[PDB]
């Protein structure tokens, strides 16, 4: 059986995989080829049934493609769209449908990265239009708009606990540390060398002054904000690092994504513990199960949902 | 009206999206031909064997629609000048694939960005595509007026924006373009899509794009202000630029999402049409010139060639020209015969090169106006023109006019003249051989005789125009020097160009020439002070003439005789363009040379660098004596 207003077909290119604190799986997918270039949002209360369409809890189709996604609590879905819009999709009371709360066209090009700030009432979006926008999710408006960068914004990552703080990186070779509290909010941080372009950002979930970034040449970097001259880095991938996700563990593992179609799992020293070649196309997301902490669920452009067992 | 298009980097259903933009009032659409986010791999397995389709089918539009309504767009992940080998290699293959798909589709144009200094490998890959079969497709290089790094918000505390003026730095985007089009060897198929931002740069920066092949202007919604009634409008400075760009007949492109959500997307368009309809009207010169803009013509040689009937017709529909000739004759006759002699002293007036007779009639209207007596002689070498003259002499003029069917240099006159009148001038004054003709004629002028015109001077000005250089470069003919097209002047209504310095007088001739040893050969050195950074492509020539006293004719822009749409400026190209820095002087040498059979010009730039001497011995160009 298929839920109401949901299509019987799923878009081949899987963009985002996000677990809710209960364990239900959020899927964002785009049609990147063929006649129709659109997107969709899917919910799976049974995560082992995904990617299969006729065995979902909820499903909706968007006008344009899904470049990025984030949970807004337990019933909210914040969408980075090709349309230049930031979309907030409100979940149903019975959690059967996915209904459009707001769709605002503020960015002048594809919105590529979205991150919800620690309060859950504010969010930051990064776009190909080179802008960075701070959003108020209740009033459905842009609070602040920053042209800090000189090239397309690749990754915006909100800090774990400060609403003022978020990282951003761009094809202009800048990693910017932000604090909405300063009159000049952004601050250029990173390694001594200019190196390769920054592609992915992830804060440490415990050390609040520490983060990790992946470059376009497959190198993962461990950076402390204070020292501002990178401590440790390993060449984890043969191609661009798409995403970096820390495990929910008190002592966390780092999941490394790539266009080399592999997933790697690393420790504190960035050493390789696990690697999966399960995917036949680009690895686009990773989420660890809130329930089984040793489980890691990846999605790819090969329309595969691979559930991993990390020891 | 206005040729305008819509820029979209998001098209979910190609058929629906096209109808919507046509409904809004757009003549075309700029869109991706592969999904912008859809990165393809060409070397490494498993991503290399990604199953198809790789984009949407060509069957989704008619051939006509692809040919006329769709401008293709390069995918933004394609970076042929990336510092990462792997990315460079995939971007090359991806660029070829998308460019070849655009060619397959039959697209009229395709957009590629210049968003950084180094675009060498992008230029290499485009050049190789351009030489892979002969096609008519155009390439639009998306360049901003202001680099994004120079317009960023001053919000990075440890990396502030440079407030210090950097004259050359503010023109960096022109250098990105110049290098790219130099590397691509000035392909006629490569043009500019000039992206205009919120805050315009210095006037000098906007002045660099003078003479450049601007085919499209990109206006983002972000740059439109909001008027009191909520409509999108532009700053007075932004309006000036649009007015300057309408003259270039560019296609305007609207990019970005709608920020005037109260109104529709035709709102941004309606402002452009409104601005289009509210421009200072095209004057008699601007209206006549329409169609001839930067169109290269050969200078007339009416001595060597017998002009066709319709050439005479063009240079007759100029009443200002013959009002001034009439006035110069009127004023001369009064100075030669006083009121007491107004019926005893009859003046020998010779029209030398009478054409179809408008100068003859002008000498008639100037005899009755001055109420003085004249005996007219109408000399003309062109026997076909003499047909029109001899029919005029029979049907209207009568015994007053004596038509002479001869060249003025070979004619034996029965009596000496009081006034010899002629229009033997061209766009560079002496370029139709007025000195030589009038020297061969002054023997039959009285010792106190008047020549109308009595003096003429040519002027030169250095110009920049990569459009006109390319236009010339295209004039190669088989069975002649592959470079002879740069060693000849062109009559051209100079349009898309930049005058680098004030016109300065070159060669002057006076009539009659009282010199015991008359020499029509010349050598002139000019020093043109340049206050811009530019590229010199050639020299525009104009003239000035004194018919009689204060009565003059001019095509020098400063002193232009108003209404004289007849004469267009001449262009003297140079084989190789020359970089000129701000503060430098352009020094040019010009010679007027001759032998018994022919006359020609030779020219060379000596400063800031040397050129070759152009047209040595009249090898590429001569004026037949
Ligand atoms: N050495 C010479 N002996 C006798 N006649 C000569 C001549 N040289 C020229 N002419 C004849 O005079 C005119 C031509 O008809 C020409 O055949 C004249 C002209 C050109 C274009 C016009 F539209 C125009 F109205 C008038 C200029 C050319 N000079």
PDB file of N, CA and C and ligand atoms in Angstrom, chain B residues 300 302-303 305-307 311-316 321-322 352-356 358 379-382 385 406-409 423-425 432 437, ligand 1:
ATOM      1  N   UNK B 300      35.999  55.107 -52.324  1.00  0.00           N
ATOM      2  CA  UNK B 300      35.733  55.400 -53.721  1.00  0.00           C
ATOM      3  C   UNK B 300      36.947  55.963 -54.410  1.00  0.00           C
ATOM      4  N   UNK B 302      36.849  57.785 -57.699  1.00  0.00           N
ATOM      5  CA  UNK B 302      36.059  58.281 -58.842  1.00  0.00           C
ATOM      6  C   UNK B 302      36.905  58.765 -60.017  1.00  0.00           C
ATOM      7  N   UNK B 303      38.216  58.901 -59.815  1.00  0.00           N
ATOM      8  CA  UNK B 303      39.143  59.239 -60.883  1.00  0.00           C
ATOM      9  C   UNK B 303      39.446  57.989 -61.727  1.00  0.00           C
ATOM     10  N   UNK B 305      37.785  54.985 -61.457  1.00  0.00           N
ATOM     11  CA  UNK B 305      36.536  54.303 -61.815  1.00  0.00           C
ATOM     12  C   UNK B 305      35.456  55.278 -62.204  1.00  0.00           C
ATOM     13  N   UNK B 306      34.595  54.892 -63.134  1.00  0.00           N
ATOM     14  CA  UNK B 306      33.431  55.717 -63.435  1.00  0.00           C
ATOM     15  C   UNK B 306      32.324  55.327 -62.445  1.00  0.00           C
ATOM     16  N   UNK B 307      31.911  56.270 -61.570  1.00  0.00           N
ATOM     17  CA  UNK B 307      30.913  55.961 -60.539  1.00  0.00           C
ATOM     18  C   UNK B 307      29.587  55.573 -61.149  1.00  0.00           C
ATOM     19  N   UNK B 311      25.529  55.628 -56.930  1.00  0.00           N
ATOM     20  CA  UNK B 311      26.556  56.199 -56.054  1.00  0.00           C
ATOM     21  C   UNK B 311      26.384  57.731 -56.035  1.00  0.00           C
ATOM     22  N   UNK B 312      26.138  58.335 -57.215  1.00  0.00           N
ATOM     23  CA  UNK B 312      25.908  59.771 -57.351  1.00  0.00           C
ATOM     24  C   UNK B 312      24.665  60.184 -56.563  1.00  0.00           C
ATOM     25  N   UNK B 313      23.571  59.378 -56.660  1.00  0.00           N
ATOM     26  CA  UNK B 313      22.287  59.585 -55.985  1.00  0.00           C
ATOM     27  C   UNK B 313      22.466  59.674 -54.454  1.00  0.00           C
ATOM     28  N   UNK B 314      23.312  58.780 -53.877  1.00  0.00           N
ATOM     29  CA  UNK B 314      23.651  58.780 -52.450  1.00  0.00           C
ATOM     30  C   UNK B 314      24.323  60.094 -52.033  1.00  0.00           C
ATOM     31  N   UNK B 315      25.312  60.554 -52.811  1.00  0.00           N
ATOM     32  CA  UNK B 315      26.072  61.746 -52.452  1.00  0.00           C
ATOM     33  C   UNK B 315      25.466  63.037 -53.004  1.00  0.00           C
ATOM     34  N   UNK B 316      24.165  62.999 -53.351  1.00  0.00           N
ATOM     35  CA  UNK B 316      23.405  64.167 -53.839  1.00  0.00           C
ATOM     36  C   UNK B 316      22.332  64.534 -52.829  1.00  0.00           C
ATOM     37  N   UNK B 321      25.352  70.134 -47.756  1.00  0.00           N
ATOM     38  CA  UNK B 321      26.573  70.124 -48.549  1.00  0.00           C
ATOM     39  C   UNK B 321      26.495  71.155 -49.680  1.00  0.00           C
ATOM     40  N   UNK B 322      25.361  71.207 -50.377  1.00  0.00           N
ATOM     41  CA  UNK B 322      25.243  72.130 -51.487  1.00  0.00           C
ATOM     42  C   UNK B 322      24.756  73.518 -51.050  1.00  0.00           C
ATOM     43  N   UNK B 352      34.531  71.754 -61.841  1.00  0.00           N
ATOM     44  CA  UNK B 352      35.496  70.732 -62.248  1.00  0.00           C
ATOM     45  C   UNK B 352      35.173  69.395 -61.604  1.00  0.00           C
ATOM     46  N   UNK B 353      34.552  68.524 -62.375  1.00  0.00           N
ATOM     47  CA  UNK B 353      34.025  67.264 -61.878  1.00  0.00           C
ATOM     48  C   UNK B 353      32.581  67.436 -61.458  1.00  0.00           C
ATOM     49  N   UNK B 354      31.718  67.730 -62.440  1.00  0.00           N
ATOM     50  CA  UNK B 354      30.343  68.186 -62.273  1.00  0.00           C
ATOM     51  C   UNK B 354      29.347  67.123 -61.876  1.00  0.00           C
ATOM     52  N   UNK B 355      29.758  65.847 -61.954  1.00  0.00           N
ATOM     53  CA  UNK B 355      28.896  64.711 -61.658  1.00  0.00           C
ATOM     54  C   UNK B 355      27.664  64.733 -62.527  1.00  0.00           C
ATOM     55  N   UNK B 356      26.484  64.595 -61.905  1.00  0.00           N
ATOM     56  CA  UNK B 356      25.194  64.681 -62.593  1.00  0.00           C
ATOM     57  C   UNK B 356      24.591  66.134 -62.594  1.00  0.00           C
ATOM     58  N   UNK B 358      24.594  68.608 -59.598  1.00  0.00           N
ATOM     59  CA  UNK B 358      24.085  69.325 -58.408  1.00  0.00           C
ATOM     60  C   UNK B 358      24.945  70.529 -58.031  1.00  0.00           C
ATOM     61  N   UNK B 379      32.827  70.636 -66.442  1.00  0.00           N
ATOM     62  CA  UNK B 379      33.780  69.583 -66.830  1.00  0.00           C
ATOM     63  C   UNK B 379      33.472  68.273 -66.086  1.00  0.00           C
ATOM     64  N   UNK B 380      33.564  67.134 -66.798  1.00  0.00           N
ATOM     65  CA  UNK B 380      33.261  65.801 -66.268  1.00  0.00           C
ATOM     66  C   UNK B 380      33.933  64.724 -67.130  1.00  0.00           C
ATOM     67  N   UNK B 381      34.757  63.871 -66.506  1.00  0.00           N
ATOM     68  CA  UNK B 381      35.446  62.799 -67.234  1.00  0.00           C
ATOM     69  C   UNK B 381      34.541  61.561 -67.474  1.00  0.00           C
ATOM     70  N   UNK B 382      33.635  61.239 -66.509  1.00  0.00           N
ATOM     71  CA  UNK B 382      32.736  60.077 -66.586  1.00  0.00           C
ATOM     72  C   UNK B 382      31.715  60.283 -67.708  1.00  0.00           C
ATOM     73  N   UNK B 385      27.990  60.080 -66.735  1.00  0.00           N
ATOM     74  CA  UNK B 385      27.505  61.242 -65.995  1.00  0.00           C
ATOM     75  C   UNK B 385      27.211  62.385 -66.990  1.00  0.00           C
ATOM     76  N   UNK B 406      35.616  65.854 -70.649  1.00  0.00           N
ATOM     77  CA  UNK B 406      37.059  65.656 -70.539  1.00  0.00           C
ATOM     78  C   UNK B 406      37.473  65.544 -69.065  1.00  0.00           C
ATOM     79  N   UNK B 407      38.696  65.044 -68.822  1.00  0.00           N
ATOM     80  CA  UNK B 407      39.338  65.086 -67.521  1.00  0.00           C
ATOM     81  C   UNK B 407      39.877  66.512 -67.384  1.00  0.00           C
ATOM     82  N   UNK B 408      39.769  67.123 -66.186  1.00  0.00           N
ATOM     83  CA  UNK B 408      40.276  68.492 -65.944  1.00  0.00           C
ATOM     84  C   UNK B 408      41.807  68.659 -66.205  1.00  0.00           C
ATOM     85  N   UNK B 409      42.570  67.558 -66.105  1.00  0.00           N
ATOM     86  CA  UNK B 409      44.018  67.570 -66.256  1.00  0.00           C
ATOM     87  C   UNK B 409      44.421  67.621 -67.720  1.00  0.00           C
ATOM     88  N   UNK B 423      34.097  69.221 -55.927  1.00  0.00           N
ATOM     89  CA  UNK B 423      33.974  68.365 -54.748  1.00  0.00           C
ATOM     90  C   UNK B 423      34.769  67.071 -54.989  1.00  0.00           C
ATOM     91  N   UNK B 424      36.114  67.216 -55.050  1.00  0.00           N
ATOM     92  CA  UNK B 424      37.049  66.108 -55.329  1.00  0.00           C
ATOM     93  C   UNK B 424      37.586  65.441 -54.072  1.00  0.00           C
ATOM     94  N   UNK B 425      36.925  65.683 -52.925  1.00  0.00           N
ATOM     95  CA  UNK B 425      37.387  65.218 -51.632  1.00  0.00           C
ATOM     96  C   UNK B 425      36.754  63.914 -51.220  1.00  0.00           C
ATOM     97  N   UNK B 432      40.953  60.991 -52.679  1.00  0.00           N
ATOM     98  CA  UNK B 432      40.366  60.809 -54.011  1.00  0.00           C
ATOM     99  C   UNK B 432      41.220  61.573 -55.038  1.00  0.00           C
ATOM    100  N   UNK B 437      44.565  66.525 -59.174  1.00  0.00           N
ATOM    101  CA  UNK B 437      43.552  66.967 -60.124  1.00  0.00           C
ATOM    102  C   UNK B 437      43.600  68.463 -60.242  1.00  0.00           C
TER     103      UNK B 437
HETATM  104  N1  LIG C   1      40.187  64.732 -62.825  1.00  0.00           N
HETATM  105  C1  LIG C   1      38.873  64.751 -63.075  1.00  0.00           C
HETATM  106  N2  LIG C   1      38.442  65.347 -64.210  1.00  0.00           N
HETATM  107  C2  LIG C   1      37.122  65.429 -64.436  1.00  0.00           C
HETATM  108  N3  LIG C   1      36.114  64.987 -63.677  1.00  0.00           N
HETATM  109  C3  LIG C   1      36.570  64.408 -62.555  1.00  0.00           C
HETATM  110  C4  LIG C   1      37.900  64.248 -62.189  1.00  0.00           C
HETATM  111  N4  LIG C   1      38.005  63.688 -60.924  1.00  0.00           N
HETATM  112  C5  LIG C   1      36.754  63.591 -60.531  1.00  0.00           C
HETATM  113  N5  LIG C   1      35.829  63.924 -61.492  1.00  0.00           N
HETATM  114  C6  LIG C   1      34.391  63.750 -61.608  1.00  0.00           C
HETATM  115  O1  LIG C   1      33.812  64.611 -60.643  1.00  0.00           O
HETATM  116  C7  LIG C   1      32.927  63.889 -59.772  1.00  0.00           C
HETATM  117  C8  LIG C   1      32.682  62.544 -60.448  1.00  0.00           C
HETATM  118  O2  LIG C   1      31.512  62.609 -61.249  1.00  0.00           O
HETATM  119  C9  LIG C   1      33.967  62.321 -61.253  1.00  0.00           C
HETATM  120  O3  LIG C   1      33.826  61.466 -62.381  1.00  0.00           O
HETATM  121  C10 LIG C   1      33.211  64.048 -58.263  1.00  0.00           C
HETATM  122  C11 LIG C   1      32.038  63.417 -57.533  1.00  0.00           C
HETATM  123  C12 LIG C   1      32.118  62.122 -57.020  1.00  0.00           C
HETATM  124  C13 LIG C   1      31.033  61.539 -56.383  1.00  0.00           C
HETATM  125  C14 LIG C   1      29.867  62.251 -56.274  1.00  0.00           C
HETATM  126  F1  LIG C   1      28.770  61.673 -55.753  1.00  0.00           F
HETATM  127  C15 LIG C   1      29.784  63.538 -56.750  1.00  0.00           C
HETATM  128  F2  LIG C   1      28.595  64.174 -56.699  1.00  0.00           F
HETATM  129  C16 LIG C   1      30.860  64.140 -57.359  1.00  0.00           C
HETATM  130  C17 LIG C   1      34.573  63.618 -57.686  1.00  0.00           C
HETATM  131  C18 LIG C   1      35.518  62.751 -58.499  1.00  0.00           C
HETATM  132  N6  LIG C   1      36.526  63.532 -59.203  1.00  0.00           N
END
